[PDB]
Structures are given as C-alpha cells and as structure tokens.
C-alpha cells in the first residue's frame, strides 16, 4: 500500500474541502478538454477495473490528516476519562500517525487545531446607474499559510501519468468548483508517495464516498447531489469517509440529465483494512 498522494497547494480560498465526487467530475471535465470526448469514457473504464481515488483531506505542513474510522465508537470503552471518551468521538479527522493506530484499535490522539477555517465573507451587488447596494452573504473555506488539501491515488501508474497528472495541471488554472471566477478553486500541484499500513482483515474503512451495493456494517450517512452543466443531479445516499464495509466494491451510477453524453457519479470505495470490535 504505497499511495500516490496528490498535494493541492491552494492559491485562493476553496469553496469546500472537495468531496471525492467533486474531484472525479472535475477530472472528467478536464479530460473532455485536453483529451477530447472518447478518452473520458476510456477513463471511466479504467476506474472500473482497478483504479481508485479518495476524497480530499487537509494537510498542515507535511502533517497529513485522514478521516477517523467509525470502527472506534462501539468499543471506545474497551480502548481506555469520560471527558476523553467524548472529545475523541467528537473528532472528524486523525493524523497519519494516528489513523494507523485506530485501524488496529490502539489508543490514540486527536489533532489539536484544524487547518482550515470556514469563514463567511459578505459581498454586495451594485446597480450600474444608481450605485445602490444589494447585500448577500457567502461563505468559503479559507486555508492557512503552509496548509492545504491533498488526496490519494492507488492504481496503475500508466493510468496516472496518462490521465490524472494532465488533469491536475489543467485544474490548477480552472478551479475545483465554487465561484472559480473569483479565484476560489485554484491551486498548484505537486505529487508524492505516501504509505499507510493496513492490517489484513475482511473489514475495511472507505476513504471515499461509498455508495454501497450491499448494506455496510457501520456507516455515517451523507446526502449530496451535484450540478452537471446547469442540470441538477438527484440527491444520492453516499456514505461519508470512514465507514466500514465487508468486501464491497462500490459502484458508479450513470445518470440521464438530458445531456449529449452520459454522466457517471464516482462512488467506488477506497478500502483500507480495519479491525472491528464485537459488533
């Protein structure tokens, strides 16, 4: 399990931490520009076979953060004081050192500070003749000086360098969603290698949106829907990152939406092994 980490060093403030499906729709819309139409459907067949990506997760000066599994909650009492049993459960992200410990059900530590800060900036709308104001709020993720966001890739490198590494240079100059005409989703890219040790067992946490075919073991549910070319997507029941499946490959559902091409929604799981308690 040596993962090609893709670091996204932000320029302007992101609209959100990109979900896994925000990325794959961004990547597919890149390859429809820098590779034409037929290479995107070829890209979709590559992720069906072996290739998997993950959701984006923050990083703070090489200290790579990762989602906390839901494997720790049913037996957090078997780990370890009541104040510690809540602040460890309330958390959302764990460090790369501490994500490996909770896969083996070891005692561990939460991070102290979160890198990003969801701030809300007020903007205004002005008519051109009378300069009369019309306020509306707006809110976006604002990252710190060193920090940023990354995500993972595991698969054949001839699919990486052929597809993703072009797309993450085209997506450095048009954003990953949000009001990317205000310089929101823009970044610069550097690639790395990253290693997470997984204990061999039949249960697995998913580092991306699961969208399962069979019912998982323990799952934090998530409802979101996208926007392809001005067309609303229906709300789908993805699972959030860090839920536990047993031998589930996930899936992608093509959607109609009245476009010239079919539109796929990435929900392929990203399994890393986990040790579950009794239930």
């Amino acid at each position: 399990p040596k993962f090609i980490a893709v670091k996204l060093i932000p320029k302007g403030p992101f609209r959100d931490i990109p979900r896994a499906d925000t990325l794959f729709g961004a990547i597919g819309n890149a390859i429809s520009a820098i590779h034409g139409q037929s290479a995107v459907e070829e890209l979709v067949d590559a992720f069906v076979g072996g290739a998997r990506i993950s959701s984006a997760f923050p990083y703070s000066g090489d200290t790579y953060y990762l989602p906390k599994p839901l494997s720790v909650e049913p037996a957090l009492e078997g780990i370890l004081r009541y104040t510690t049993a809540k602040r460890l459960r309330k958390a959302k992200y764990l460090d790369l050192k501490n994500f490996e410990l909770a896969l083996r059900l070891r005692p561990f530590t939460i991070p102290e500070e979160i890198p990003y800060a969801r701030v809300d900036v007020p903007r205004v709308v002005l008519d051109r003749v009378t300069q009369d104001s019309s306020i509306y709020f707006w809110e976006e993720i604002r990252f710190r000086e060193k920090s940023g966001v990354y995500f993972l890739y595991s698969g054949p490198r001839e699919v990486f360098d052929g597809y993703i590494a072009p797309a993450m240079r085209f997506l450095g100059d048009t954003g990953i969603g949000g009001k990317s005409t205000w310089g929101a989703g823009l970044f610069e890219v550097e690639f790395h290698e990253m290693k997470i040790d997984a204990p061999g067992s039949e249960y697995s946490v998913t580092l991306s949106n699961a969208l399962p075919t069979k019912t998982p073991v323990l799952w934090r549910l998530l409802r979101k829907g996208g926007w392809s070319f001005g067309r609303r997507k229906p709300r789908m029941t993805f699972i959030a990152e860090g839920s536990i499946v047993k031998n589930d490959p996930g899936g992608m559902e093509r959607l109609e939406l009245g476009l010239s091409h079919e539109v796929y929604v990435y929900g392929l799981t990203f399994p890393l092994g986990v040790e579950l308690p009794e239930g």
Binding site: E73, P74, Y82, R220, P234
Partner: protein, 772 residues
C-alpha cells in the same frame, strides 16, 4: 377491570404516609390508609375506595401473615359488585407487594422533608407545583411541623372527591402536592413520594402483563428472572433539523418546529403505552428527544416493539430526508437488577447495556429501510426554498407569505401553526384521516385545541397545567410542560426577529444564546433505582420547563442577587424562548437582555441545584439580516469553545487571541462577574450612557482596545504598559484602570493572561450598549 384495579393498587398504596405525618389516626399507616379510603367511599364516593383500601392495608409485609388474615376480611367484602374473582383479588395484593419492594430497593425516624436530589444534605421546604411565584431552593434542613400535614390531607380529601377514579386522573393530583414530600423518612432520602408511588404502580402493571401469580411472587422466582424490559429511545439529529432553514420564517417558524418535535416525541411514547397496555406511570422520563419506558418481557410485546420502531422510522425517512432518526432499543432485565446488590450498581450497568445498543443503532443510522441505498431516478425533483427538502415538482405549493415562492406543504402547516401559538391550550391526539389536523406524526394526528374551542380526539395533550379544566370525562389527560415565554407584538401574536432588536438596548442586534448542562450523562448514572432516576430526571426537567419562565418574568431577587446588567429588568421583557429541553436551551431575544438573562439563568440554576451542576452558555451577537442556520452554527461552535475548556464558563464576545495555547477565550462565570463589578460601575452608569466627564471620550475606549491589539501581535512586549499610563494621563483620567497601568508579577509566574487580555469583553459590552 382486573387490569386497572392493580394499576391504582400500587399507586394508592403508600397513601397513608401523608396522613401519618399529620397524625389523624394511630401509627402503622397501612392501618391509616385503610380508614382513609374507607370513609371516602362513604360520602361522594364510588365502590372501589372500599376495595382500593385493600392495597394500602396489606403491604410492607406485616399484614399478610400465614396467607390467612387476607381472606376473612375480604370474605365479607364483595368483589362481585364489579366481577372480581376471590382469588384474582388476592393476586393483586401480592403484585403490589413485590413492586413496592422493587421500586424502593434496599429499604421512619422523625418527620424529615424531601432531601434534595443534588445536595442530599439540604432539603426542600414543602411547596406546591405550577412553577409560579416560587423557586424551590434547597435550604437548611427543617423538619416539617405536623400542623402543615393536616391541610395537605384536607385539600387532598377534596381533590380525590372531584377527580374521576381512574389511573390518569389521580397522577396529576398526587404530582400536584406530594412532589416535595419524602417517601421514607430517613437520613438524606432524595426519593419523592409521588415517584415512589408512581413506579410502584408502573412495575405492578408490568408484573400483571409478564404473567406472574400470587405464589410465584411469594416464591423467589419472580425476582431474579428476566421479566422486565427497559425501552429507551433517542432522537439523533435534532439540531440539524430545527435550525437548518434559510432566511425565511422568522421565529414564528423556529418556534413552531421546536414544538413539532415534541409532538413526535409524544406520538411514539403514547403509542408504546397503548399498544403494550401501559399507563403514563410507565414513562420514567421524556425530555429533549429522549425517553425511557419500563415494560414487560413477553414474547408478545417484543413483536409489538419491532412494529412500533419499523413504522416510526419509515415515517421519519419519507417525511424528512434522513435528517431526523428515532433509535429505539430495549433490553430485558431481571427484578433484582433495579436495586443495588452488595456494593455494585446493577441498574447503571443495565443502563450501559442499553445505552450501548443506542450507540450502535445511531451508527447504523437507517438499517431497517431496505430501500435506503436503492437507486431510482424520478423525473424532475426540486428543493424547497425555506427548509431545503427535495420534493417532486407540483407538490411544491405557494406559501402563506408570498404566492411567488413554491414552498413545501409541510412548511405551510408550520407557518399556520406559527400563528396559532398564542391562541393555543394543548393538542389532541387523533387519527390520521380526520378533519382539522394541522400536523401528522409517525402514528397519529394532532388537532389544535384553541383558546375558544372544544377538545376532539381520544387523548388530549395539555400544555403547562395539571388540571383537567375543559376536558371531557372519557378522555385521557396527558400533561406536557414546555418553556413557552414569548414577547407579544402589538397584535396578538409571536414576535419577529426584526421586532426584538429594534426594541433592544443601545444598537440593534439579535442576541442568541445556546447553553447546556455539562456532565449530566455522568450524573444520571449516579442513580441506582427507578424511584431515584425518575425523580432526578424530573427535577432537572422542571427547571428548563417551568422555572425558566419565572426567571424571564422577572422574579427571585433574593435568590439571584445582582447580575451584569445594562439596565434593570423591564416589566414585559422581549425574550423569545425558542427551545429548552431539560439538558439544553436555545433562547433568542433583545441582545442586551439575553446578555442579562444568561447570568440570571446561571445564578438561579446554581441555587436550584445545591451548587453542584453548572451551565455553559455560549453567547453570540448577530444581525437581524442573518439566516438562522448560520446563527445556530456559529453559536454552537462558541458553545464547544466554552465546553472543551472548563465546562463552567461563558462565551461573551468574539475575541482575538494569541496562537500559543496559554490564552483561552471564554470567561469563567465567577471570574467574569467580578470583572463587571470592578470595570463597569466606574466607566458605565446605566441605561446606555457613560459616567461623568467620560462623554466626548468614546474615541478613548476604542484606543484602549487598540492597545489590547498590540498585546495580541506580541504578548512578550511590554509596550502596552506605558501606553496604558499615558493615554489615561493626557485625557486626565489617571484614576480609571489601575489594574492595567502596571504589570502583574503574580500573573507572569502563574502563566495566566495579563489584565489587558481580560479587558476586551468587559469594554465591548459597555461600548456596544452605547450607540458606538
């Protein structure tokens, strides 16, 4: 019937204790309650009062001797007047006997009152309920004079004569008077007399359903066998449900949601009670989207509880797109599992077996659906502009504000309910396909019982009063309390966001506070019997339900004292209690009275509890033009700022801090209320104006908050020490702020903030109360 006669048999058993502490007859209150129920059957009485004297007479085991005394007395008495069998009336005596021991636990001295559930050293002076003109503060112990117990009985003599002899009608009478009466006179008894008679009735109704007979109760088989079944549920997703609405529906709509959630909370609990054959005594508590019912362990009931749960959740999936979930779990216990055995608390670890089944079920958030992860693309859905639910087109109907927007159908029922809140006296639980129902629950429909109107339905929820005023004789009376203060507008209605802040002190702003009791889940594990937990979850319940109304009405100056207050409390304050659950509250209002209220709630809470539990209030200040889903988002994060630090501390103002970690933001409660005593009466006089000769120097207090901004870029610099001294010199104000002109060598060695760090929040409240 034979069912209900055992239900009142446990409920009316320990009566005789309130006639014992007077001394109308001799001792042995089982002999007293036999005479107290015999003479009530004489005048203005039914026939059961002679027969319900049997239950009070033969408990405590001094009266069932050789199983032989019980028969000859009731050989003369006639059970055929209602059709009771000679042995089946003997059966109900044993069942009340065992339930009289199970709710009690391991257990006369003199006449000690109700010792308080938070400090068992202190006690309650005896008082009535209804939360009006009285705050029961646990004070010094005073054994009650026996002359007081005479007028208690005569008032109870009259109230038992009027009320229908029925299980749901004696409960609001016994809760009215015997709430503050101790059951067993002992050292630090914190078990009330209402609850000890209520759980005695609650268990006896389950022992009848479990299927035990008289000699099985006599044998040791009925205890130490799995026959009881602790149902417990919880709503997970309340704060993500009420507050996630956009900039529509200002405060008539949020106040409608928070009572809509309580309807669903009762529409499930009352569904469990009817389907299992249980009364309202079998509810241990129900507050804040979390209940607990004691029930029987049959194979028959567990078939029913899976039907209740699967029908609730599939309602909560279509009507709300997985925003709210009702996780119901049960666990079979034995009889011995209630009381403490040895030194080990069996009831806590039996509650940990049940709370863990909650924690797993909150993870598998929608498991019993089977169309959950199924995908079917339906043509052309759209979403609501108010609440953001996705509906198919055509179901979106025009609103009650503008015909331009196309809101949910379930929002127009909550705007119309948003106007019917002052014109309201309760709800009526009735069938789904009825006329006049605003809102539907997971099992039934709720008709509004207005100001002028007649109640309709088979069960009638009645808000904030325990007396069946205009209720028919056939109906069931289910009283629920709710924190319900609201400032009325010039009309007869609920205030707006944009009314409260125009009528505020100083500048205009909306003052949201959201605070909650800390370490409360560790507190309810201290209890070790169903008598003890039903009390502690009810006295904690009535603070945020009833006694928070009397604080906002402006009372109890002896208990509270003086708070950090910009102006003295008005007659009709402009405060809108959105939600207040029992562990939690969320109150909006005029932003310089919410500031005054938070120190007025905390002060009264610290004397309601005997100094043992604390609040953590997270104050925010937001403009009227602000969507509520952001106001609850920022304030709850200002809550968890004041929660993870010390759990006894108030957030006051958004304040800048160094990146070291030594400087924590939110003020300790006692530490802040001396910063008001020093800083405020020397720079502020009251009612939004400043002290003498400090006017035309409001530029100064901004400059004094500029020097605080030099402490934040560099904490190590001592540039703030002389700039403090000089700016007070040039303006001639050398007398003000002596704590800030000099460094504190005591504060350096303690590694605590300097006194220029604390001055930000105490200056801004004085500054924002002036127009600034």
């Amino acid at each position: 019937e034979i069912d209900e006669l055992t239900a009142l048999g446990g409920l009316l058993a320990n009566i005789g204790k309130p006639v014992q502490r007077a001394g109308l007859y001799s001792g042995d209150h089982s002999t007293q309650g036999a005479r107290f129920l015999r003479d009530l059957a004489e005048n203005t009485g039914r026939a059961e009062y002679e027969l319900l004297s049997l239950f009070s007479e033969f408990h405590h085991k001094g009266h069932m001797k050789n199983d032989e005394l019980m028969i000859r007395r009731i050989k003369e008495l006639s059970p055929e007047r209602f059709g009771l069998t000679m042995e089946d009336v003997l059966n109900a005596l044993w069942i009340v006997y065992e339930a009289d021991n199970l709710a009690s636990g391991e257990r006369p001295q003199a006449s000690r009152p109700l010792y308080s559930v938070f400090n068992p050293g202190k006690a309650y002076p005896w008082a009535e309920l209804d939360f009006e003109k009285e705050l029961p503060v646990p004070g010094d112990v005073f054994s009650i004079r026996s002359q007081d117990y005479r007028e208690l009985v005569k008032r109870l003599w009259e109230e038992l004569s009027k009320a229908k002899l029925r299980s749901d009608r004696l409960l609001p009478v016994l809760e009215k008077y015997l709430t503050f009466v101790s059951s067993v006179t002992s050292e630090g008894n914190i078990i009330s007399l209402y609850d000890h008679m209520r759980m005695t009735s609650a268990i006896a109704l389950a022992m009848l359903r479990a299927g035990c007979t008289a000699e099985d109760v006599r044998s040791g088989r009925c205890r130490k066998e799995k026959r009881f079944l602790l149902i417990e549920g919880d709503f997970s997703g309340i704060q993500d449900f009420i507050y996630r609405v956009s900039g529509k529906g200002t405060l008539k709509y949020l106040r409608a949601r928070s009572a809509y959630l309580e309807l669903i909370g009762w529409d499930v609990v009352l569904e469990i009670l009817s389907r299992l054959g249980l009364t309202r005594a079998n509810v241990v508590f129900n507050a804040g989207g979390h209940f607990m019912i004691i029930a029987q362990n049959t194979p028959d009931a567990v078939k029913e509880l899976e039907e209740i749960r699967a029908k609730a959740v599939e309602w909560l999936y279509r009507e709300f797109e997985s925003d709210l979930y009702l996780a119901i779990e049960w666990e079979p216990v034995s009889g011995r599992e209630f009381g403490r055995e040895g030194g080990k608390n069996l009831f806590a670890e039996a509650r940990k077996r049940l709370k863990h089944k909650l924690t797993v079920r909150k993870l598998k958030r929608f498991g019993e659906i089977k169309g959950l992860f199924e995908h079917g693309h339906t043509e052309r859905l759209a979403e609501c502009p108010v609440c953001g639910r996705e509906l198919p087109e055509g179901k979106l109907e025009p609103s009650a504000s503008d015909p331009e927007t196309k809101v949910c159908p379930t929002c127009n029922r909550l705007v119309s309910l948003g106007g019917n809140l002052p014109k309201l006296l309760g709800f009526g639980r009735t069938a789904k396909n009825d006329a006049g129902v605003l809102v539907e629950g997971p099992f039934s429909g709720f008709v509004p019982y207005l100001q002028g109107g007649r109640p309709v339905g088979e069960q009638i929820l009645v808000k904030n009063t325990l007396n069946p005023g205009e209720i028919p004789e056939s109906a069931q009376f289910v009283p629920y309390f709710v924190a319900d203060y609201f400032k009325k507008d010039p009309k007869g209605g609920v205030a707006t966001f944009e009314e409260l802040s125009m009528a505020s002190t100083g500048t205009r702003r909306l003052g949201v506070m959201k605070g909650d009791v800390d370490r409360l889940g560790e507190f309810f594990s201290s209890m070790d019997s169903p008598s003890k937990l039903a009390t502690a979850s009810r006295f904690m319940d009535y603070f945020f339900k009833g006694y928070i109304g009397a604080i906002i009405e402006g009372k109890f100056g002896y208990i509270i004292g003086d708070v950090p207050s910009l102006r003295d409390w008005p007659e009709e304050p402009d405060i809108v209690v959105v939600y207040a659950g029992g562990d939690d509250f969320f109150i909006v209002g005029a932003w310089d009275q919410i500031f005054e209220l938070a120190f007025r709630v905390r002060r009264a809470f610290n004397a309601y509890t005997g100094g043992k539990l604390t609040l953590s209030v997270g104050l925010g200040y937001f403009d009227e033009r602000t969507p509520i889903y952001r106001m609850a988002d920022v304030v709850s994060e200002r809550l968890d700022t004041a929660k993870d630090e010390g759990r006894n501390r108030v957030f006051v103002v958004g304040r800048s801090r160094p990146l070291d970690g030594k400087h924590k933001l939110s003020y300790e409660w006692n530490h802040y209320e001396e910063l008001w005593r020093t800083y405020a009466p020397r720079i502020y006089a009251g009612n939004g104006r400043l002290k003498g000769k400090l006017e035309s120097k409001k530029g100064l207090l901004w400059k004094l908050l500029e020097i605080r901004e030099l402490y934040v870029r560099d904490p190590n610099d001592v540039r703030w020490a002389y700039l403090t001294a000089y700016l007070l010199g040039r303006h001639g104000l050398s007398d003000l702020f002596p704590e800030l002109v000099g460094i504190d060598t005591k504060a350096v060695e303690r590694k605590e903030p300097q006194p220029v760090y604390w001055v930000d929040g105490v200056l801004k409240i004085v500054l924002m109360a002036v127009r600034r």
